Amino acid sequence: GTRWAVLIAGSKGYHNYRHQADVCHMYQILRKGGVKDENIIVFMYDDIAYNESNPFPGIIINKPGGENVYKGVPKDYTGEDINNVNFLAAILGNKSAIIGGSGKVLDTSPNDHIFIYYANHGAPGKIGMPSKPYLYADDLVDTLKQKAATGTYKSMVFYVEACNAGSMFEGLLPEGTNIYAMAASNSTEGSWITYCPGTPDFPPEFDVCLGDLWSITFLEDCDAHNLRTETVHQQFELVKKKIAYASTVSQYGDIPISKDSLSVYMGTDPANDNRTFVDPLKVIHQHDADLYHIWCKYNMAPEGSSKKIEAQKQLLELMSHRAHVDNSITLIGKLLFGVNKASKVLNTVRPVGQPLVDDWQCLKAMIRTFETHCGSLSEYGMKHTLSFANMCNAGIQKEQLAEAAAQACVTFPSNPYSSLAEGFSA
Amino acid sequence: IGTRWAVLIAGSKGYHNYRHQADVCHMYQILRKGGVKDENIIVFMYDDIAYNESNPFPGIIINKPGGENVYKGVPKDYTGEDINNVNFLAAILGNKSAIIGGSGKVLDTSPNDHIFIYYANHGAPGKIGMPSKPYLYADDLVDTLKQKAATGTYKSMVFYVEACNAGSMFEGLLPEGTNIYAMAASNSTEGSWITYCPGTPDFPPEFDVCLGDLWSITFLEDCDAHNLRTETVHQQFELVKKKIAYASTVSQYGDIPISKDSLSVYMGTDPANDNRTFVPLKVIHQHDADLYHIWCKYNMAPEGSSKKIEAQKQLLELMSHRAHVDNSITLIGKLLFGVNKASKVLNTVRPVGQPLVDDWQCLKAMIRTFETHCGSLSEYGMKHTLSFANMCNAGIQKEQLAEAAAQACVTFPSNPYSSLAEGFSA
Ligand SMILES: *[C@@H]1O[C@H](CO)[C@@H](O[C@@H]2O[C@H](CO)[C@@H](O[C@@H]3O[C@@H](C)[C@@H](O)[C@@H](O)[C@@H]3O)[C@H](O)[C@H]2NC(C)=O)[C@H](O)[C@H]1NC(C)=O
Ligand SMILES: *[C@@H]1O[C@H](CO)[C@@H](O[C@@H]2O[C@H](CO)[C@@H](O[C@@H]3O[C@@H](C)[C@@H](O)[C@@H](O)[C@@H]3O)[C@H](O)[C@H]2NC(C)=O)[C@H](O)[C@H]1NC(C)=O
Ligand SMILES: *[C@@H]1O[C@H](CO)[C@@H](O[C@@H]2O[C@H](CO)[C@@H](O)[C@H](O)[C@H]2NC(C)=O)[C@H](O)[C@H]1NC(C)=O
Ligand SMILES: *[C@@H]1O[C@H](CO)[C@@H](O)[C@H](O)[C@H]1NC(C)=O
């Protein structure tokens, strides 16, 4: 067969440098392993390498002293072409459903191998897209089930770097689909970011973090050995042990597929033929990366300068929106369930093997109806899919949420993060 | 001394225009082998060739039947509708703040830097194509270069133009003392030629498109053949002029003393050709490439098949539009200057050193008012810029053209080539 790959950075903006650096690094592994460009679909916004804020134009690094991972990466879908339509049509191998971009799709046959890698972002039952709406677990798993029912591949390995990455598969991805999935975090955990300003042997020109903790660990591992000697299971156990202090690396789908060597999906760099596989970093939360970047921007700028005043204003707008969104959800929950029961209900997590929500259309409606009254959730507010999922499972309807949200937000917010200009999250 | 910079642009779109993107891809491989860095090579290509449904080799683009995959490793900065006048002229000027979409890579050149610009699509008198309308007119291009020469920092520049009437882009416009030397595939009055076309030598029978343009092929294959430290821009000018002489007249513009420099000053040199010291093809007109492609498509399709019926219909639509546009211009001319006087007046070409038109805004207005009454000029009708320039220079106003065109076209055409859906040409 042929080795196929789908690499996607689900975010945009220079502060999300890491997600595109992660995906660029994954391409270099595949290229060195002999995986052909015509079989590697790349989704990356492309607002990093030639950004005004980038101190090294044309260079993207995924490690403090690392190689330029940006050089040679074939960009198939950039800008607003990274969306649900193009991403799900690429997985299904449907060229006729593609709008913009190169038109490269998974035109696979039953002996082919597929490696999917997503890096950005997440929230319970949600993965980001640079252009709204976001990708929800129901739509992603339905696409994979459709692709599995077609029988145009031998086996598939899906690596997802996001907050609550396990919620994308838990109680959704069935067995016998020949899909094995590995997640940075479980259904209730957030993911972590490493290689951050002023902590390692870091270049002082950068105000952004270079990589994501789980991505860095698995990617650097792929570089270290002859991938014919390391199985997907050995990598699962290794990266789980390493990242244990931060998050719980989780498995989903056909776990017997992880018996295969990494070379089945990635190939192997002939330079590491002799490097046979033999069986803590200063980290910050993914959710606090926006706050941290603006803090770094603010701290690095001179006193009294226009850049410092701008960054201080940006920090207040960011904090105001955080408070607005959190206080709105708190008031809604108390209006809905009562002052004392509100916390218990909205923070309820489901047991192992159970999906986030039973009614996915309710969840999407809950997200939309909150945003029409209370404004956009932005990146921060997406954590509240746990609150909306708990409302859906408790028998709450969109009409009950709308009446509570109109009472919680008498006036629509002016804050730029509350802007519905880019559309709704669902 | 200094850095080598490049701007590569394929000004067309559509699988039938395969050659223009293959030409640009080939030029990148020359620069990459010569040591010119990716962060200094701005690439503009639509990217609808490599993964086109019609391409028999997905991921591969060839600029010669026995050629290498010129598509592999090409960094795409501006794709799709991001290839436009705003982004192209802002890239030349080095103005990042004027860029909308794409990577944001611009000519941020210093006084010691060398620039190589290569355009391939498409042309018409005083016009070069853009995949997204409006087109680029000689006044706007030369004004940008004059701005870059007056306020921009660089040592020298070489501009290579592959287009019909390529010389009309500079003739009577580009002044001396700019350090811009320009080389054109054809002079101000003649069209350009296409090679590596179906059914001639031992050409791949899966292709129904031409792989390259005559002038591009000749200069590109030359760049591959020698140590570019031993060949000057002048030697290449004389060599490619002698070779292509049967088809078109290779023309020079601007600071001709700049051609004394070796090709390595702008392109570098492939260390593989260090020892290689510097010491007719079956061709079809660029204007007839749309006709020929549909003929090839029609001939290759089986009898009675849906593809053959479709291609036959496409050929009639193409021919009908050609006749419509030509007959409209002929009637307008006779309405304006008389039945027997019109032909000479409209077909008058410029003597050496004279610009196409004195009033460029009149020319643009003439193009627009013709199209509002008689429909789009398309690729074919763009040759009539000469007819409109002659009307402008003869003292004809847009109101006189509108009254003549309303009399020539009582009814707006239904033909798909006459569609103003993509906007006006000017
Ligand atoms: C460099 O990195 C920053 C990301 O932080 C990015 O800035 C963003 O640029 C957007 C468009 O250029 C801009 O969006 C809006 O688009 C138009 C249509 C209007 O709505 C405007 O209000 C606005 O320009 C967005 O505001 C801006 N984001 C931030 C956080 O400043 C750059 O574009 C990146 N790209 C490059 C090529 O360097
Ligand atoms: C642009 O390049 C065109 C070529 O398409 C060129 O036109 C050619 O001019 C030749 C004279 O320089 C001319 O040659 C003549 O041909 C016949 C009539 C004999 O008398 C010959 O002895 C004589 O040399 C050739 O016919 C003519 N071709 C065409 C198609 O018109 C122009 O000179 C160039 N135009 C400009 C504005 O520089
Ligand atoms: C393959 O090339 C053809 C052009 O020959 C492209 O088809 C055009 O697509 C645009 C947008 O989809 C339409 O507006 C036109 O009607 C199409 N033209 C024709 C002649 O079919 C097509 O987009 C290309 N495919 C890829 C993957 O880029
Ligand atoms: C997720 O991992 C955390 C450890 O950080 C643990 O508290 C929790 O029990 C796990 N949740 C699920 C749903 O397995």
mmCIF file of C-alpha atoms in Angstrom, chain B residues 47-332:
data_model
loop_
_atom_site.group_PDB
_atom_site.id
_atom_site.type_symbol
_atom_site.label_atom_id
_atom_site.label_comp_id
_atom_site.label_asym_id
_atom_site.label_seq_id
_atom_site.Cartn_x
_atom_site.Cartn_y
_atom_site.Cartn_z
ATOM 1 C CA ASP B 47 -2.194 26.048 -7.348
ATOM 2 C CA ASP B 48 -5.011 24.409 -9.401
ATOM 3 C CA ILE B 49 -2.663 22.219 -11.510
ATOM 4 C CA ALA B 50 -0.898 19.527 -9.335
ATOM 5 C CA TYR B 51 -4.130 18.140 -7.773
ATOM 6 C CA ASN B 52 -6.500 18.904 -10.674
ATOM 7 C CA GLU B 53 -8.995 16.106 -11.610
ATOM 8 C CA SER B 54 -7.580 16.411 -15.199
ATOM 9 C CA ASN B 55 -3.911 15.970 -14.127
ATOM 10 C CA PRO B 56 -2.777 12.364 -14.946
ATOM 11 C CA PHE B 57 0.051 12.640 -12.322
ATOM 12 C CA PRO B 58 -1.270 14.012 -8.967
ATOM 13 C CA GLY B 59 1.396 16.056 -7.160
ATOM 14 C CA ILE B 60 3.615 16.250 -10.279
ATOM 15 C CA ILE B 61 4.097 19.248 -12.651
ATOM 16 C CA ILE B 62 6.507 18.822 -15.636
ATOM 17 C CA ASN B 63 7.940 21.679 -17.778
ATOM 18 C CA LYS B 64 9.345 19.144 -20.350
ATOM 19 C CA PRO B 65 8.267 15.563 -21.333
ATOM 20 C CA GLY B 66 11.391 13.974 -19.805
ATOM 21 C CA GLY B 67 11.590 16.635 -17.074
ATOM 22 C CA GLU B 68 11.744 16.559 -13.304
ATOM 23 C CA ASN B 69 8.791 17.244 -11.014
ATOM 24 C CA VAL B 70 9.210 21.042 -10.863
ATOM 25 C CA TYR B 71 6.274 21.311 -8.289
ATOM 26 C CA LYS B 72 8.093 19.536 -5.382
ATOM 27 C CA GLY B 73 9.397 22.049 -2.798
ATOM 28 C CA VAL B 74 7.998 25.257 -4.341
ATOM 29 C CA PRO B 75 6.983 27.635 -1.457
ATOM 30 C CA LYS B 76 3.526 29.040 -2.328
ATOM 31 C CA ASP B 77 3.171 32.542 -0.817
ATOM 32 C CA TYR B 78 0.086 33.720 -2.765
ATOM 33 C CA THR B 79 -2.406 31.126 -4.132
ATOM 34 C CA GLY B 80 -5.969 31.282 -5.460
ATOM 35 C CA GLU B 81 -7.585 34.741 -5.497
ATOM 36 C CA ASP B 82 -4.641 36.147 -3.415
ATOM 37 C CA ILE B 83 -2.772 36.580 -6.752
ATOM 38 C CA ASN B 84 -4.073 40.089 -7.569
ATOM 39 C CA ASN B 85 -2.691 43.608 -8.339
ATOM 40 C CA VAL B 86 -2.817 44.765 -4.670
ATOM 41 C CA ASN B 87 -0.711 41.813 -3.375
ATOM 42 C CA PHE B 88 1.674 41.723 -6.366
ATOM 43 C CA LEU B 89 2.511 45.474 -6.406
ATOM 44 C CA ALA B 90 2.725 45.603 -2.556
ATOM 45 C CA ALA B 91 5.175 42.604 -2.649
ATOM 46 C CA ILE B 92 7.476 44.436 -5.196
ATOM 47 C CA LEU B 93 7.385 47.649 -3.097
ATOM 48 C CA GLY B 94 8.083 45.674 0.114
ATOM 49 C CA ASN B 95 4.856 46.874 1.789
ATOM 50 C CA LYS B 96 3.675 44.155 4.239
ATOM 51 C CA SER B 97 0.805 46.388 5.584
ATOM 52 C CA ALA B 98 -0.882 46.448 2.123
ATOM 53 C CA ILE B 99 -0.975 42.599 1.828
ATOM 54 C CA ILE B 100 -4.404 40.850 2.147
ATOM 55 C CA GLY B 101 -4.136 37.043 2.412
ATOM 56 C CA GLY B 102 -1.147 34.828 1.708
ATOM 57 C CA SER B 103 2.067 34.406 3.729
ATOM 58 C CA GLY B 104 2.887 38.141 3.879
ATOM 59 C CA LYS B 105 6.346 37.670 2.209
ATOM 60 C CA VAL B 106 7.488 40.946 0.517
ATOM 61 C CA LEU B 107 10.666 42.399 -1.153
ATOM 62 C CA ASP B 108 12.294 43.835 2.016
ATOM 63 C CA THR B 109 15.448 44.700 0.041
ATOM 64 C CA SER B 110 18.604 46.611 1.168
ATOM 65 C CA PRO B 111 20.836 48.821 -1.167
ATOM 66 C CA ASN B 112 23.220 45.912 -2.053
ATOM 67 C CA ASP B 113 20.547 43.304 -2.882
ATOM 68 C CA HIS B 114 19.789 41.884 -6.339
ATOM 69 C CA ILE B 115 16.252 41.255 -7.623
ATOM 70 C CA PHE B 116 15.085 38.777 -10.269
ATOM 71 C CA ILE B 117 11.424 39.111 -11.317
ATOM 72 C CA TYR B 118 9.872 36.447 -13.523
ATOM 73 C CA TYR B 119 6.312 36.728 -14.910
ATOM 74 C CA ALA B 120 4.710 33.945 -17.068
ATOM 75 C CA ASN B 121 1.121 34.225 -18.645
ATOM 76 C CA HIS B 122 -1.154 35.831 -20.905
ATOM 77 C CA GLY B 123 -0.451 39.261 -22.355
ATOM 78 C CA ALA B 124 -1.935 41.846 -24.730
ATOM 79 C CA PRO B 125 -0.745 45.386 -25.720
ATOM 80 C CA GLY B 126 0.020 47.180 -22.406
ATOM 81 C CA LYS B 127 -1.580 44.376 -20.329
ATOM 82 C CA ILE B 128 -0.420 41.257 -18.384
ATOM 83 C CA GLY B 129 -2.959 38.854 -16.874
ATOM 84 C CA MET B 130 -3.918 38.244 -13.247
ATOM 85 C CA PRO B 131 -5.861 35.057 -12.248
ATOM 86 C CA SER B 132 -8.406 37.389 -10.549
ATOM 87 C CA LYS B 133 -9.702 40.469 -12.546
ATOM 88 C CA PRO B 134 -8.790 43.361 -13.093
ATOM 89 C CA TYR B 135 -5.619 42.749 -15.116
ATOM 90 C CA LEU B 136 -2.228 44.475 -14.676
ATOM 91 C CA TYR B 137 -1.698 47.403 -17.062
ATOM 92 C CA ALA B 138 1.742 48.781 -18.072
ATOM 93 C CA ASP B 139 1.076 52.196 -16.418
ATOM 94 C CA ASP B 140 0.460 50.578 -12.945
ATOM 95 C CA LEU B 141 3.409 48.152 -13.246
ATOM 96 C CA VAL B 142 5.929 50.807 -14.519
ATOM 97 C CA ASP B 143 4.676 53.334 -11.856
ATOM 98 C CA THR B 144 5.382 50.705 -9.123
ATOM 99 C CA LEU B 145 8.913 50.040 -10.565
ATOM 100 C CA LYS B 146 9.572 53.838 -10.835
ATOM 101 C CA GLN B 147 8.473 54.152 -7.153
ATOM 102 C CA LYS B 148 10.803 51.260 -6.162
ATOM 103 C CA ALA B 149 13.646 52.814 -8.253
ATOM 104 C CA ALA B 150 13.137 56.308 -6.693
ATOM 105 C CA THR B 151 12.489 55.406 -3.020
ATOM 106 C CA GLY B 152 13.361 51.696 -2.797
ATOM 107 C CA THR B 153 16.802 50.296 -1.964
ATOM 108 C CA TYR B 154 18.504 47.733 -4.269
ATOM 109 C CA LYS B 155 21.659 47.427 -6.437
ATOM 110 C CA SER B 156 20.087 45.996 -9.626
ATOM 111 C CA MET B 157 17.051 44.173 -10.993
ATOM 112 C CA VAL B 158 16.363 41.823 -13.942
ATOM 113 C CA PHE B 159 12.671 41.432 -15.056
ATOM 114 C CA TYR B 160 11.844 38.430 -17.354
ATOM 115 C CA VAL B 161 8.369 38.610 -18.999
ATOM 116 C CA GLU B 162 6.676 35.641 -20.710
ATOM 117 C CA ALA B 163 3.472 37.097 -22.332
ATOM 118 C CA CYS B 164 1.971 38.155 -25.709
ATOM 119 C CA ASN B 165 3.186 41.735 -26.654
ATOM 120 C CA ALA B 166 5.539 41.531 -23.566
ATOM 121 C CA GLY B 167 7.578 44.508 -24.866
ATOM 122 C CA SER B 168 4.523 46.881 -24.666
ATOM 123 C CA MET B 169 4.838 46.649 -20.833
ATOM 124 C CA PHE B 170 8.052 48.711 -20.995
ATOM 125 C CA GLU B 171 8.222 50.428 -24.432
ATOM 126 C CA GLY B 172 7.949 54.214 -23.956
ATOM 127 C CA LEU B 173 7.291 53.777 -20.215
ATOM 128 C CA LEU B 174 10.334 52.416 -18.297
ATOM 129 C CA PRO B 175 12.899 55.216 -17.942
ATOM 130 C CA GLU B 176 16.692 54.883 -17.777
ATOM 131 C CA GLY B 177 18.771 55.096 -14.608
ATOM 132 C CA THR B 178 16.488 52.708 -12.615
ATOM 133 C CA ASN B 179 18.951 49.710 -12.586
ATOM 134 C CA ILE B 180 16.065 47.617 -14.026
ATOM 135 C CA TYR B 181 16.944 45.621 -17.123
ATOM 136 C CA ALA B 182 13.962 43.879 -18.744
ATOM 137 C CA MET B 183 13.819 40.915 -21.176
ATOM 138 C CA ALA B 184 10.613 40.015 -23.035
ATOM 139 C CA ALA B 185 9.495 36.821 -24.900
ATOM 140 C CA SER B 186 8.074 39.028 -27.690
ATOM 141 C CA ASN B 187 8.166 42.664 -28.881
ATOM 142 C CA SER B 188 5.294 45.236 -28.415
ATOM 143 C CA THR B 189 3.370 43.998 -31.557
ATOM 144 C CA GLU B 190 3.837 40.229 -31.626
ATOM 145 C CA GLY B 191 2.330 37.366 -29.639
ATOM 146 C CA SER B 192 4.253 34.672 -27.747
ATOM 147 C CA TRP B 193 4.600 30.957 -28.586
ATOM 148 C CA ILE B 194 3.933 27.616 -26.795
ATOM 149 C CA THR B 195 5.801 24.264 -27.038
ATOM 150 C CA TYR B 196 5.732 20.630 -25.644
ATOM 151 C CA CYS B 197 2.224 20.268 -27.066
ATOM 152 C CA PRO B 198 0.141 17.121 -27.771
ATOM 153 C CA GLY B 199 0.942 15.033 -30.865
ATOM 154 C CA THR B 200 4.379 16.035 -32.274
ATOM 155 C CA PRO B 201 7.552 14.127 -31.000
ATOM 156 C CA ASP B 202 7.200 11.284 -28.451
ATOM 157 C CA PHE B 203 4.945 13.462 -26.198
ATOM 158 C CA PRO B 204 3.062 11.869 -23.210
ATOM 159 C CA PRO B 205 -0.350 10.766 -24.621
ATOM 160 C CA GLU B 206 -2.181 11.307 -21.244
ATOM 161 C CA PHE B 207 -1.699 15.131 -21.496
ATOM 162 C CA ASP B 208 -4.085 17.318 -23.593
ATOM 163 C CA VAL B 209 -2.170 20.520 -22.550
ATOM 164 C CA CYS B 210 1.180 22.083 -23.508
ATOM 165 C CA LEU B 211 3.925 21.788 -20.863
ATOM 166 C CA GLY B 212 5.801 25.052 -21.508
ATOM 167 C CA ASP B 213 6.142 28.308 -23.440
ATOM 168 C CA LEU B 214 8.863 28.585 -26.160
ATOM 169 C CA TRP B 215 10.821 31.526 -24.655
ATOM 170 C CA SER B 216 10.541 30.205 -21.057
ATOM 171 C CA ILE B 217 11.715 26.652 -22.015
ATOM 172 C CA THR B 218 14.703 28.091 -23.976
ATOM 173 C CA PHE B 219 15.969 30.393 -21.204
ATOM 174 C CA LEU B 220 15.085 27.921 -18.342
ATOM 175 C CA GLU B 221 16.836 24.889 -19.964
ATOM 176 C CA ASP B 222 19.841 27.209 -20.666
ATOM 177 C CA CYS B 223 20.046 28.148 -16.888
ATOM 178 C CA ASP B 224 20.205 24.349 -16.172
ATOM 179 C CA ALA B 225 22.952 23.657 -18.795
ATOM 180 C CA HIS B 226 25.834 25.880 -17.521
ATOM 181 C CA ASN B 227 27.886 27.383 -14.677
ATOM 182 C CA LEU B 228 25.944 30.713 -14.484
ATOM 183 C CA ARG B 229 29.180 32.560 -13.390
ATOM 184 C CA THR B 230 30.457 32.112 -17.010
ATOM 185 C CA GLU B 231 27.248 33.316 -18.738
ATOM 186 C CA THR B 232 26.111 36.970 -18.697
ATOM 187 C CA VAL B 233 22.458 38.178 -19.034
ATOM 188 C CA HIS B 234 23.505 39.659 -22.495
ATOM 189 C CA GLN B 235 24.862 36.255 -23.707
ATOM 190 C CA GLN B 236 21.538 34.650 -22.690
ATOM 191 C CA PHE B 237 19.669 37.502 -24.456
ATOM 192 C CA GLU B 238 21.593 36.899 -27.751
ATOM 193 C CA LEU B 239 21.459 33.066 -27.466
ATOM 194 C CA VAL B 240 17.676 32.780 -26.754
ATOM 195 C CA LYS B 241 16.981 35.526 -29.402
ATOM 196 C CA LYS B 242 18.855 33.493 -32.137
ATOM 197 C CA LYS B 243 17.124 30.205 -31.041
ATOM 198 C CA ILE B 244 13.487 31.533 -30.947
ATOM 199 C CA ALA B 245 14.004 33.932 -34.022
ATOM 200 C CA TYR B 246 11.667 31.814 -36.249
ATOM 201 C CA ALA B 247 8.762 32.394 -33.805
ATOM 202 C CA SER B 248 9.198 35.724 -31.918
ATOM 203 C CA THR B 249 11.636 38.654 -31.387
ATOM 204 C CA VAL B 250 13.221 38.545 -27.886
ATOM 205 C CA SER B 251 13.311 42.212 -26.717
ATOM 206 C CA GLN B 252 15.363 44.290 -24.165
ATOM 207 C CA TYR B 253 14.245 47.322 -22.128
ATOM 208 C CA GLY B 254 15.557 49.642 -19.404
ATOM 209 C CA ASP B 255 19.209 49.775 -18.333
ATOM 210 C CA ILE B 256 20.786 47.514 -20.986
ATOM 211 C CA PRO B 257 24.333 47.953 -19.399
ATOM 212 C CA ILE B 258 22.970 45.832 -16.410
ATOM 213 C CA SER B 259 22.953 42.762 -18.794
ATOM 214 C CA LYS B 260 26.828 42.804 -18.567
ATOM 215 C CA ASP B 261 26.381 40.973 -15.191
ATOM 216 C CA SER B 262 26.539 37.194 -15.024
ATOM 217 C CA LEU B 263 23.316 35.199 -14.462
ATOM 218 C CA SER B 264 24.795 34.019 -11.091
ATOM 219 C CA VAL B 265 24.480 37.632 -9.759
ATOM 220 C CA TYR B 266 20.662 37.064 -9.747
ATOM 221 C CA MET B 267 20.277 33.208 -9.901
ATOM 222 C CA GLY B 268 23.448 31.785 -8.317
ATOM 223 C CA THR B 269 24.833 28.589 -9.871
ATOM 224 C CA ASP B 270 24.222 24.827 -9.354
ATOM 225 C CA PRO B 271 27.596 23.382 -8.100
ATOM 226 C CA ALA B 272 26.803 20.312 -10.311
ATOM 227 C CA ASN B 273 27.436 22.478 -13.444
ATOM 228 C CA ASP B 274 30.763 24.046 -12.229
ATOM 229 C CA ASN B 275 32.673 22.340 -15.080
ATOM 230 C CA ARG B 276 29.926 23.211 -17.645
ATOM 231 C CA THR B 277 31.375 26.568 -18.913
ATOM 232 C CA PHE B 278 29.257 28.721 -21.264
ATOM 233 C CA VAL B 279 30.336 28.575 -24.954
ATOM 234 C CA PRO B 280 13.162 24.048 -34.503
ATOM 235 C CA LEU B 281 10.473 22.950 -31.979
ATOM 236 C CA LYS B 282 6.812 22.250 -32.935
ATOM 237 C CA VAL B 283 5.135 25.430 -31.740
ATOM 238 C CA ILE B 284 1.549 26.894 -31.416
ATOM 239 C CA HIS B 285 0.462 30.560 -30.739
ATOM 240 C CA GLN B 286 -0.442 31.547 -27.119
ATOM 241 C CA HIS B 287 -3.717 33.127 -28.410
ATOM 242 C CA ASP B 288 -4.770 29.678 -29.863
ATOM 243 C CA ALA B 289 -3.979 27.639 -26.679
ATOM 244 C CA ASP B 290 -7.639 27.613 -25.513
ATOM 245 C CA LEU B 291 -8.779 26.421 -29.043
ATOM 246 C CA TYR B 292 -5.996 23.763 -29.214
ATOM 247 C CA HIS B 293 -6.665 22.405 -25.666
ATOM 248 C CA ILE B 294 -10.403 21.930 -26.395
ATOM 249 C CA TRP B 295 -9.476 20.350 -29.814
ATOM 250 C CA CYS B 296 -7.086 17.909 -27.962
ATOM 251 C CA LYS B 297 -9.767 17.241 -25.272
ATOM 252 C CA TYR B 298 -12.337 16.617 -28.128
ATOM 253 C CA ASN B 299 -10.002 14.405 -30.244
ATOM 254 C CA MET B 300 -8.847 12.268 -27.220
ATOM 255 C CA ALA B 301 -12.441 11.615 -26.002
ATOM 256 C CA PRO B 302 -14.251 8.496 -27.396
ATOM 257 C CA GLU B 303 -16.965 8.863 -30.070
ATOM 258 C CA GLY B 304 -20.492 9.298 -28.680
ATOM 259 C CA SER B 305 -19.122 9.859 -25.116
ATOM 260 C CA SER B 306 -20.338 12.717 -22.864
ATOM 261 C CA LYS B 307 -16.794 14.219 -22.719
ATOM 262 C CA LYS B 308 -16.720 14.528 -26.564
ATOM 263 C CA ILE B 309 -20.191 16.204 -26.782
ATOM 264 C CA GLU B 310 -19.132 18.631 -23.962
ATOM 265 C CA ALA B 311 -15.804 19.492 -25.730
ATOM 266 C CA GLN B 312 -17.577 20.035 -29.099
ATOM 267 C CA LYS B 313 -20.043 22.477 -27.378
ATOM 268 C CA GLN B 314 -17.063 24.244 -25.653
ATOM 269 C CA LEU B 315 -15.350 24.710 -29.062
ATOM 270 C CA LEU B 316 -18.466 26.364 -30.603
ATOM 271 C CA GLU B 317 -18.878 28.702 -27.538
ATOM 272 C CA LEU B 318 -15.131 29.652 -27.836
ATOM 273 C CA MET B 319 -15.391 30.293 -31.660
ATOM 274 C CA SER B 320 -18.740 32.191 -31.299
ATOM 275 C CA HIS B 321 -17.211 34.580 -28.695
ATOM 276 C CA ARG B 322 -14.103 35.138 -30.926
ATOM 277 C CA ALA B 323 -16.430 36.099 -33.863
ATOM 278 C CA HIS B 324 -18.700 38.218 -31.587
ATOM 279 C CA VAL B 325 -15.766 40.268 -30.121
ATOM 280 C CA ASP B 326 -14.012 40.691 -33.505
ATOM 281 C CA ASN B 327 -17.245 41.639 -35.376
ATOM 282 C CA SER B 328 -18.248 44.108 -32.576
ATOM 283 C CA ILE B 329 -14.838 45.893 -32.743
ATOM 284 C CA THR B 330 -14.996 45.963 -36.593
ATOM 285 C CA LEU B 331 -18.548 47.515 -36.568
ATOM 286 C CA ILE B 332 -17.570 50.034 -33.781
#
